[PDB]
Amino acid sequence: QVQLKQSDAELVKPGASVKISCKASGYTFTDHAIHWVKQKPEQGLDWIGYISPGNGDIKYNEKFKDKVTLTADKSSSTASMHLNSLTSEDSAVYFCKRSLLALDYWGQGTTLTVSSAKTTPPSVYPLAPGSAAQTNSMVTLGCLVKGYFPEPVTVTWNSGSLSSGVHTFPAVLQSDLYTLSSSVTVPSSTWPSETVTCNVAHPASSTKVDKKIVP
Amino acid sequence: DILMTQSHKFMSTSVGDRVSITCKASQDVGTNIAWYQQKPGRSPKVLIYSASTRHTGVPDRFTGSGSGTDFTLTISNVQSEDLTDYFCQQYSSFPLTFGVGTKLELKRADAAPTVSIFPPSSEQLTSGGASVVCFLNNFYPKDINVKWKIDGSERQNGVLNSWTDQDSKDSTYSMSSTLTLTKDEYERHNSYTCEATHKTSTSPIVKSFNR
Ligand SMILES: *[C@H]1O[C@H](CO[C@]2(C(=O)O)C[C@H](O)[C@@H](NC(C)=O)[C@H]([C@H](O)[C@H](O)CO)O2)[C@H](O)[C@H](O)[C@H]1NC(C)=O
Ligand SMILES: *[C@H]1O[C@H](CO[C@]2(C(=O)O)C[C@H](O)[C@@H](NC(C)=O)[C@H]([C@H](O)[C@H](O)CO)O2)[C@H](O)[C@H](O)[C@H]1NC(C)=O
């Protein structure tokens, strides 16, 4: 019955602020304080603060000074976190949770990305071998998926019909945009005699790139 | 603030084995401690609270111990679904604070990387860029070092690396290393080498090409 349901992913510029909300359901909203937690890739969790709806008690972590304002609207059973003066270091997944010891009562999380980058589709460059000196029964090809924003992109090869022997890597940041690479390793008897295409989808720009790898 | 130090960022185990994850508090929190599991993408799930009480629904394979500053989560009879992230939380004092997390990984036979280096495409070059990409696929263990050389001499500037997590099917790791130059810089040199050192070989694995 107990559910904490958060608002959708946010993407915002440096300097802006944002409101992330948390709709509680299946219990009496005033029975339990709502806590907020920040999770940044690799690094730990940071507790942000809590709001006690039936009480009005608000505690903050000094760490996030004048950065955070917590609210609640008893009418819709919703707790909110307003963040201001955002920087790219605020990019993280933010969670609400029920009580100081939450057990399984966490929200699903809200992704915040803070960036000055514009939405930009990937440019896709083919990776193919030139002539080798010896005969290889296997061959590796790839795609360099460069300069897109925001995350994510998905990559398949020959529309998924080719999936064993594929490696797609996490993106890195390169000039304020994302770059990733993908490899596929196939028998040399199947390429270039048969067509191999990397399929790149970037939902944010509604873009699909189908790059054929030619010798 | 109360600092929670978790022993190890990575531990290796085998299905059926027992493994323990420690967490040290920078001061006494009695038993005001919780252990959480967290899978990629998902929200945390409690395993233990009061340092030793198992939450209803959690397999009996998971136990917790300790009181004061030192706490241990133990997983007996490890299953593959358990190969994920675990962190501790102290709740004696605000701010609430958390361990940085421990990832459990599967032991498997050693495996040398399969290495492939690619020159920049002509399409990239015509746009004034030269990314040389090196894949180091399907190796184990995770620890690996990649060095680039141009005309025999080490290059550091312009390299970006990316690493996968352990593969769900074969338990290997893969890495990509990309050296990006201008077209003009690329064109001043002859030889481009990706060198990998891994415990499977006493000599580096070297893949290379010449323009
Ligand atoms: C302090 O915590 C209360 C809720 O108290 C309980 C509860 O009964 O709901 C006490 C109970 O013993 C807790 N369970 C366990 C296993 O210890 C229970 C759970 O932690 C909770 O139900 C999970 O959501 O909490 C209020 O939430 C109160 O607001 C809170 N104070 C603050 C500042 O967070
Ligand atoms: C039950 O109460 C807790 C917190 O309790 C206090 C607190 O802030 O510690 C008790 C404290 O003595 C009060 N402060 C002072 C100076 O008297 C304080 C006030 O009542 C509050 O600050 C007024 O704004 O409350 C949590 O707030 C917890 O959420 C609450 N339980 C529920 C379910 O709301």
CATH number at residue B80: 2.60.40.10
- Can you tell me whether residue A130 is helix, strand or coil? coil
CA distance A115 to A86: 9
Nearest-atom number in ligand 1 for the CA of A55 is 29
Which token pair is A30?
């005033």
CA distance A63 to A97: 19
Q: How many CB atoms lie within 10 A of CB B55?
A: 15
Which domain does B179 fall in, by range?
A: 114-210
A chain contacts of residue B119, beta-carbon cutoff 8 Å: 130
B44 with A106: Cβ contact below 8 A: yes
Please, are residues B48 and B65 in contact by the beta-carbon 8 Å criterion? no
Residue type, B207: K
Method: X-ray
Please, are residues B83 and B19 in contact by the beta-carbon 8 Å criterion? no
Please, are residues A49 and A60 in contact by the beta-carbon 8 Å criterion? yes
Q: CATH 2.60.40.10: does it fit domain A123-212?
A: yes
CA distance B130 to B39: 37
Please, are residues B64 and B75 in contact by the beta-carbon 8 Å criterion? no
Cα-to-chain-centroid distance, residue B39: 14
Per-residue burial over B176-199, b = 16 or more CB atoms within 10 Å of its CB, e = otherwise? bbbbbbeeeebeeeeebbbbbebe
Ligand 2: which residue has its CA nearest to atom 16? A57
CA distance A212 to A193: 13
C-alpha distances (whole Å) from B155 to each of B172, B194, B197 are 27, 10, 16
Count of all residues that appear for chain A in the document: 215
What's this structure's resolution in Å?
Answer: 1.9
B13 forms beta bridges with B106
Domain's final residue, options B106, B139, B169: B106
Q: Which residue in the set B34, B96, B174 is minimally distant from A167, CB to CB?
A: B174
Cα-to-chain-centroid distance, residue A77: 27
B154 forms beta bridges with B149
Q: Residue B32 C-alpha to ligand 1 middle, in angstroms?
A: 13
CA distance B5 to B26: 8
Please, are residues B24 and B69 in contact by the beta-carbon 8 Å criterion? yes
Strands (E), A45-202: 45-52, 57-60, 68-73, 78-83, 92-98, 110-114, 123-127, 138-148, 154-157, 166-168, 172-174, 177-187, 197-202
One-letter-per-residue 3-state SS of B136-180? EEEEECCCCEEEEEECCEEECCCEEEEECCCCCCCCCEEEEEEEE
CA distance A50 to A70: 7
Please, are residues A88 and A77 in contact by the beta-carbon 8 Å criterion? no
Which token pair is B124?
């990239």
Residues A208, A211, A214: CA angle, nearest 5 degrees: 170
Question: Whose CA is closest to A141, among A197, A66, A88?
Answer: A197
Question: Whose CA is closest to A125, among A98, A95, A146?
Answer: A146
CA distance B81 to B15: 10
Which are the contacts of A84, defined by CB distance < 8 A and separation ≥ 6? A17, A66, A67, A68, A69
Residue type, A110: T
Answer yes or no: do B80 and B27 share one domain: yes
CA distance B20 to B78: 11
Answer yes or no: do B77 and B140 share one domain: no
Q: How many CB atoms lie within 10 A of CB B17?
A: 12
CA distance B161 to B176: 6
Q: How many CB atoms lie within 10 A of CB B26?
A: 13
Q: How many CB atoms lie within 10 A of CB A84?
A: 13
Answer yes or no: do B80 and B130 share one domain: no
Question: Whose CA is closest to A155, among A203, A198, A184?
Answer: A198
DSSP B54-99: EPTTS-TTEEEEE-SSEEEEEESS--GGG-SEEEEEE-SSSSPEE-
Please, are residues B119 and B164 in contact by the beta-carbon 8 Å criterion? no
A chain contacts of residue B35, beta-carbon cutoff 8 Å: none
B10 touching A, CB under 8 A? no
Question: Whose CA is closest to A53, among A84, A69, A75, A37?
Answer: A75
Residues A29, A34, A39: CA angle, nearest 5 degrees: 145
CA distance B209 to B151: 10
Domain's final residue, options B106, B138, B170: B106
Q: How many CB atoms lie within 10 A of CB A33?
A: 21
Answer yes or no: do B24 and B88 share one domain: yes
For residue B95, whether the previous peptide bond is cis, meaning omega lies within 30 degrees of 0, is yes
Answer yes or no: do B91 and B23 share one domain: yes
Please, are residues A98 and A77 in contact by the beta-carbon 8 Å criterion? no
CA distance A79 to A57: 13
Which token pair is B195?
């060198």
Question: Whose CA is closest to B80, among B170, B209, B193, B176?
Answer: B170
Which token pair is A156?
């398949």
Domain's final residue, options B106, B131, B152: B106
What is the homologous superfamily of the domain A3-114 according to CATH?
A: Immunoglobulins (2.60.40.10)
Residue type, A48: I
Structural domain count, chain B: 2
Question: Whose CA is closest to A174, among A202, A133, A144?
Answer: A144
Nearest-atom number in ligand 2 for the CA of A57 is 24
Question: Whose CA is closest to B139, among B104, B117, B105, B114?
Answer: B114
Give residue limits of the domains in chain A: 3-114, 123-212
Q: Indicate which of A51, A181, A184 best probes the interface with B, i.e. most B CBs within 10 Å of its own CB.
A: A181
A104 touching B, CB under 8 A? yes
